[PDB]
Structures are given as C-alpha cells and as structure tokens.
Amino acid sequence: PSQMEHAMETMMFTFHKFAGDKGYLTKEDLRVLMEKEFPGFLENQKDPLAVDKIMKDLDQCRDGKVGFQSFFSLIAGLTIACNDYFVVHMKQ
Amino acid sequence: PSQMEHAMETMMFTFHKFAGDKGYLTKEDLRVLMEKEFPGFLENQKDPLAVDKIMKDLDQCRDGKVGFQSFFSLIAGLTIACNDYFVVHMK
Amino acid sequence: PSQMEHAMETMMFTFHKFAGDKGYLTKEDLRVLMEKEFPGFLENQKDPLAVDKIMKDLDQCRDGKVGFQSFFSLIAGLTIACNDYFVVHMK
Amino acid sequence: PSQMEHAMETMMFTFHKFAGDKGYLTKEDLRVLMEKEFPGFLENQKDPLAVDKIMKDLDQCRDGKVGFQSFFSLIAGLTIACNDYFVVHMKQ
Amino acid sequence: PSQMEHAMETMMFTFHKFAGDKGYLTKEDLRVLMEKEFPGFLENQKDPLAVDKIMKDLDQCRDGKVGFQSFFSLIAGLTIACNDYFVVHMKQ
Amino acid sequence: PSQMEHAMETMMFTFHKFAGDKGYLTKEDLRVLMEKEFPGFLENQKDPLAVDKIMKDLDQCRDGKVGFQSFFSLIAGLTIACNDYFVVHMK
Amino acid sequence: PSQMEHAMETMMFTFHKFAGDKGYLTKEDLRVLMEKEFPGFLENQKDPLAVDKIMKDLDQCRDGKVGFQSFFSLIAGLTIACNDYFVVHMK
Amino acid sequence: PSQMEHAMETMMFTFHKFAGDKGYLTKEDLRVLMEKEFPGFLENQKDPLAVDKIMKDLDQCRDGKVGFQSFFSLIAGLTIACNDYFVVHMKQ
Numbered sequence: 001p002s003q004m005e006h007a008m009e010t011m012m013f014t015f016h017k018f019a020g021d022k023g024y025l026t027k028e029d030l031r032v033l034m035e036k037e038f039p040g041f042l043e044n045q046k047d048p049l050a051v052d053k054i055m056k057d058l059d060q061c062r063d064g065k066v067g068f069q070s071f072f073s074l075i076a077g078l079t080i081a082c083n084d085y086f087v088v089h090m091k092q
Numbered sequence: 093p094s095q096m097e098h099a100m101e102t103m104m105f106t107f108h109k110f111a112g113d114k115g116y117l118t119k120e121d122l123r124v125l126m127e128k129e130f131p132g133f134l135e136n137q138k139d140p141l142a143v144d145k146i147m148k149d150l151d152q153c154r155d156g157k158v159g160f161q162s163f164f165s166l167i168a169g170l171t172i173a174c175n176d177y178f179v180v181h182m183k
Numbered sequence: 184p185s186q187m188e189h190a191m192e193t194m195m196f197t198f199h200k201f202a203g204d205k206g207y208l209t210k211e212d213l214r215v216l217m218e219k220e221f222p223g224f225l226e227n228q229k230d231p232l233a234v235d236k237i238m239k240d241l242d243q244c245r246d247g248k249v250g251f252q253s254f255f256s257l258i259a260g261l262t263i264a265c266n267d268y269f270v271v272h273m274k
Numbered sequence: 275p276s277q278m279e280h281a282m283e284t285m286m287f288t289f290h291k292f293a294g295d296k297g298y299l300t301k302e303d304l305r306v307l308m309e310k311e312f313p314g315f316l317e318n319q320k321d322p323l324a325v326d327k328i329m330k331d332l333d334q335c336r337d338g339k340v341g342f343q344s345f346f347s348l349i350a351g352l353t354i355a356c357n358d359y360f361v362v363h364m365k366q
Numbered sequence: 367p368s369q370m371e372h373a374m375e376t377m378m379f380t381f382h383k384f385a386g387d388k389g390y391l392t393k394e395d396l397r398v399l400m401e402k403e404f405p406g407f408l409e410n411q412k413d414p415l416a417v418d419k420i421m422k423d424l425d426q427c428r429d430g431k432v433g434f435q436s437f438f439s440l441i442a443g444l445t446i447a448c449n450d451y452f453v454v455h456m457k458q
Numbered sequence: 459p460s461q462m463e464h465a466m467e468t469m470m471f472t473f474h475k476f477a478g479d480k481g482y483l484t485k486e487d488l489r490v491l492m493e494k495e496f497p498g499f500l501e502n503q504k505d506p507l508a509v510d511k512i513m514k515d516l517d518q519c520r521d522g523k524v525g526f527q528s529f530f531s532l533i534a535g536l537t538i539a540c541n542d543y544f545v546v547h548m549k
Numbered sequence: 550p551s552q553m554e555h556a557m558e559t560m561m562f563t564f565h566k567f568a569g570d571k572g573y574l575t576k577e578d579l580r581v582l583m584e585k586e587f588p589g590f591l592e593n594q595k596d597p598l599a600v601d602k603i604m605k606d607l608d609q610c611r612d613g614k615v616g617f618q619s620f621f622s623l624i625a626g627l628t629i630a631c632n633d634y635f636v637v638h639m640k
Numbered sequence: 641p642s643q644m645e646h647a648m649e650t651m652m653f654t655f656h657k658f659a660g661d662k663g664y665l666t667k668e669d670l671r672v673l674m675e676k677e678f679p680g681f682l683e684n685q686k687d688p689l690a691v692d693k694i695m696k697d698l699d700q701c702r703d704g705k706v707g708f709q710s711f712f713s714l715i716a717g718l719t720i721a722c723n724d725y726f727v728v729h730m731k732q
Contacts, residue, residue: 001222002128002129002130002131003102003106003129004102004103004106004129004130004167005129005130005223006099006102007099007100007102007103007106008099008167008170008171008174010095010096010098010099011096011099011171012171012174012175012178014095014096014099015175023179036094037094037095037096037097038094038096038097039093039094039097040093040094040097060609060610061609061610061612063610068172068175068179069172072168072171072172075096075100076164076165076168078100079100079103079104079164080160080161080164082100082101082104083104083107083160086104087115123272130223130227131222131223131275132221132222132223132224132265132279133223133227134268135264135265135268135269136221136224136261136264136265137264137268138260138264138511139511140264140267140268140270140271140272141271145504145505152700152701153700153701153703155701169229170227173226173227173228173229173231174223174226174227176231177225177226177228177231178226179231180231180232181214181231184313184314185310185311185312185313185314186284186288186311187284187285187288187311187312187349188311188312188313188314189284190280190281190282190284190285190288191281191349191352191353191356192356193277193278193280193281194278194281194353195353195356195357195360197277197278197281198357206361219276220276220277220278220279221276221278221279222276229602230602236595236596243426243427244426244427244429246427251354251357252354255350255353255354256350258278258282259346259350261282262282262285262286262346263342263343263346265282265286266286266289266342269286270297270342334518334519335518335519335521337519367588368494368495368496368497369468369472369495370468370469370472370495370496370533371495371496371589372465372468373465373466373468373469373472374465374533374536374537374540376461376462376464376465377462377465377537378537378540378541378544380461380462380465381541389545402460403460403461403462403463404460404462404463405459405460405463406459406460406463434538434541434545435538438534438537438538441462441466442530442531442534444466445466445469445470445530446526446527446530448466448467448470449470449473449526452470453481489638496589496593497588497589497641498587498588498589498590498631498645499589499593500634501630501631501634501635502587502590502627502630502631503630503634504626504630506630506633506634506636506637506638507637535595536593539592539593539594539595539597540589540592540593542597543591543592543594543597544592545597546597546598547580547597550679550680551676551677551678551679551680552650552654552677553650553651553654553677553678553715554677554678554679554680555650556646556647556648556650556651556654557647557715557718557719557722558722559643559644559646559647560644560647560719561719561722561723561726563643563644563647564723572727585642586642586643586644586645587642587644587645588642617720617723618720621716621719621720622716624644624648625712625716627648628648628651628652628712629708629709629712631648631652632652632655632708635652636663636708
C-alpha cells in the first residue's frame, strides 16, 4: 500500500511474468521484456544490438541466465539516468 | 508508455517529494520517507537508531546528504529482499 | 470497560483467529499472522527464512506448535521496540 | 493499521498518557492507571493492597519507577490469564 | 584459548560426554552427571530426591529430555549461588 | 572436586578479575573483558558500538553497573550459540 | 620489500592454503578457513548456519565455488569493521 | 594471532602510521605511503603520475581525503592483480 510498495511490487511481478516458473530471464525473455516494458529506452537509443549489449553486461556468470538482482541493476541504471535527465530539466 | 517506466518514475518522484527543492535527503528526510513509505520498517527494529547505521552506509562523503543514486541502493536492497521472500514462500 | 482491556482482547482474538479450533499456531500460521498483522515485517528482512529463526526461539518443546504465552513474547518484543523508537524520535 | 498495530499503539499511548514527560510510572501513576484501565482486574481481586503488591513485583530496581518494559510484564500476565479463562470457557 | 573459552568448552564437552549421540540427558544421565560432576552440591544438600527435584524443574516440556539450554540453567543457578557464597566470604 | 565445578569457578574468578574490589563491571570493564576473553568478538562486528547494545540489555536499572547474574546471561548466550554451532557441524 | 606487500601475500597464501590445487573454496573450505583464521567468529554467532548466508553473498554464480576476488570482499568487510572499532575505542 | 589477524593488523597500523591523528591520507601522505610500502608496484608501472592517478581514483568525494575504506580498495586492487599473476605462474 504505500506508493513505493506498489512500485516495488510492480517490478517484482513484471520480472516474474516474463521469467515464468524457471525464475530467470534468457536473452529472448529479456528481449521481449524490453520491447514491452522499456519502449522509451528502446526508441531513444537506436543500436540494432542494444539488447545484445545489455545481456552481455548483465550475464556476469556467462550462463545466459538473468536473475532478479542482475535485472535490478538494469532498472537502477535506467532509473538514475532518468533522474539525471529530470533534474537537468528543472528550470524556467 | 509502460508499467515498468511508471514504477521507475514513482521512485524518482518519491525521492524528490521528501528531498524538496534542495534535491537531497538529510537523515530526517530519510527517516520520514521510511516511516511513510515503509510503515513499520524502522519502528519494529531492535535498534531504535537503525536509521543512523543506514545513513552511514549511504552517506559516503559524510556530509549528511543523501543523493538519488544512494537512495536507489536502499530501495534495491529492500526490493531484492522482498523478491527473495516471495520466491521462497509465494511459489 | 477499558481501552487497555479492549487492546488486550484484540491480541487474544488475533491469536485464535490464526490458531483456529486447534488452539495453537504452526510455523505457517505464524508466518501468515505476520504477513497480515505486521505487513512488511518478514518481507523486508535480509533473511527470507527469518520466520524459522523466530519459530525456533518460540517453540521450546520443538513440537512445531506455538501457544499463546510464546506468541505473547513475540508481541512484547515488537511493542517494546516500537516504544523505544517512539521515545527516541517522537518526543 | 492492522488490528494488532492499533492494539500495540493503544498500549503505548496509554502508558505515555499516565507517565507524562518523565516517561515512567510512580506507584501513584500506577494506581491511577489501574483504576482507570484495569477495572475488570480491580473489581475481581479484592485485596485492599493489590496495587501495592503489583508495584513491589514490578519495581525490580527498587527505585519506585515503572518503565515500559516492566509495565509490559503486567499486561502480559493479565492477558495470558485472560486467555486461560477464555479457553476454559470454550464449551457447549 | 582464553580462560573463559576453555571453561565454556569444558561445559560443552561435559554435557556431550554424558549425553552421547542422542544429545540430550535422561533423568539417569542427569543422575550420573551430577554424582560425577557436582559432588560439592550433592554433599551439601542432603535430600534423597535432589536429582528428582532438579529433573522436574529442568524438564519444562515434560518429555524426560534435558537439552543443553535447560542444562545451562542448572549451571547458571549453581554458579550464581557459588558467587553469592564467595562474595559473602570476602572479609577480615 | 570436578571439571564442571572448576569451570564454574573460572567464570566466577573471571568476573571478579575485571570487576576488581568494586564487585561490578562498568561498560569499559565489560569491553575489556570481551577483548581479552573473547578475542575478535567485538572487533569483527559491523557495529563498533555493539558493546553499548550489550550493556543496554544487561543493565536493567540503567545505573551503568553489571553484576554477576547479568554477566552470566551474556556467557549463557555465547555458550549456547557455540553449542548450537558444534552440534550442527562437529557431529 | 615491504610490510604491506608481505601482508598482502599472507592473504593470498592463506586463500590457496585452504583452496588447495583446485584454486577455489567450497563452503566447507570457507568454514574451516574461518574456524582457523578467525577463531570464534562463526562459533559465537546466534545463527549456526551463518556461513551459508556468507556463502550466498559470495557465490554470485551459485556454483558453490568461492574465488579469490570474492574471498577478498569478506576480508575487506572484516578489516574495515576492525578498523572502525579501533578508531572509536583505541584512540 | 592467526596469520590473517596479523596481516589485517599490519594494514590497519600501516594506514594509521601514515595518516597520523587526523586519520585520513592527503595526496602527499599517499605518496609517502606508496614509496615506502608499495615499491614493487612503483618500480613496475613507470608513469611519473601514478600516485596522481590513484588519488583521483580514490578521492570519490573530491575532498582530498583518503579514508581507510577507500584505501582498502587500493589494497584490494593490488592484491587481486598480485594473485592473478601468482596463479598464471603455477606451471612446470
């Protein structure tokens, strides 16, 4: 019930929805997740291999499996840059 | 645009709500943020000064100011812990 | 009769609500009691198996059953901790 | 907001109301607290010195000051006996 | 290696020696333990049923099994009374 | 007379060694007792002020004095924890 | 060459001593390393399975193997904590 | 007393020796520390500004003060590379 609890819940559910019962993301689940849930980031940085570069960044164990924790880094990275952009706006 | 983007913004908006024009959180802004956003989290701890230990891990420069990136690491720890509990018990 | 008596009864009624006819709490009844009565208390812990450590301190006989008196010691620890936080910060 | 949170809050506030700014109960605050908040226990056990016996029981430091923790023991004692009585009812 | 570590070790080993692989004391293991390890207390309090009264005190679960924790209470009780006696000596 | 009696005395003698004529331990006597009797126990904790939380649970009267009985509860907690570890891992 | 270099090597040599030819530490090698290098550290904890929580933070890949870099983060946490205690109390 | 305790002690003392009563390293304390305690690393990487590049790396707060924690990163970095080198030797 607070606004933050709702937000954390939606990140958790989001990840589980695309991870299914195995509970990890494969490059292809990652790809479907990003196209559906990170359009904003996908429409702005137009490299054909964005998802391929994120996956190599995210798969520290080099086993093709993205856990919640690694997934969370992605979210962190993008939320912080979104904040940098938001603060730089602040003006008149 | 998306549920994930919307949630990301809620965390961004939540930090500024408590930060105010100054754009940073002091230990008291941090405490109030928790009391209101995570009801009972600080209150039920054994240590009533637990927010001081949290402030300590989050204020690297020891200038008593908590910026967005540091705030984010606190939210990451709580979200991961909540994810671990849910996996173990909510199937 | 009184506000204090009424509150005492709410804790008594709360234990039986989760205990059910059997009159005792198993580790899962304990877990659900917390999830519903103390939202986020177990969920935000670092250890997702913290309820097992709690069950351990509360089930002296190791028969996996938690009676009223034991339940009470858990509530006492939470109420005291909440009192300590309030004294330190709510003046 | 759960039923238990409301209950703990009312025990905390109760104690602070009768303790005032010093944050401890003297025998006389204890006496006023019991007459106001534990009528049920006061009407059933009719010893003229009930409060005097509880105070000696509760003042482990023998300094006439009852802290929240010691106060909580009292509440514990009475809630448990109230539960023993309640379970023994259960019948038909 | 400190003096206290050695002491804790000897209480632990003592208990395990008399508990054997099941890791609990039965009334009879308790009895053998006390006759061997608490002579001082056994020679001073001469009730024929000392061990029977300690066992009922110690078996809170009423299942005839004495765990390390319960055993530790016994040790606590006797060490504290030994200390009370020791301090009362202090004189000249 | 016995190995158990001898060990009991070592704990009794250890308390008075640090207590001195005064017969009680202040927070600093407690700290030094640990540094010397339990090397690394306080030092490796995350919280450098952990002895204050220990003093808090042990000084009920808040008079800054630790008597024998209270000291004993600290030793009981350490001995039980060491027993639990040994049972789980030393067979 | 230097006291600092020599100490660095002692940690490097300590990891391989317990790792053996295999060059990695399993949870049991980790446990024994602590029992011998940090006497009482695991033993006095409340949780007798604390090494499992430590293994968990250190084995990112969940392959039950602890490499040098991960080992180093454990030593860093212990050394920093020991430094904080010494600053607060040893002047 | 174990070998690791002695090693941690020597890193702690080392740092305090060069930090003195203020308990932080200035670029110049860093420079003296490195010339005295990291000869091996100083003789192998011959850039005239090594210490200047480490200091910028280490002063995350940009306040010219190196705390024990930041100092520890340096030690970490160099011990790990020393280990990489050591393992790569292993041969015959």
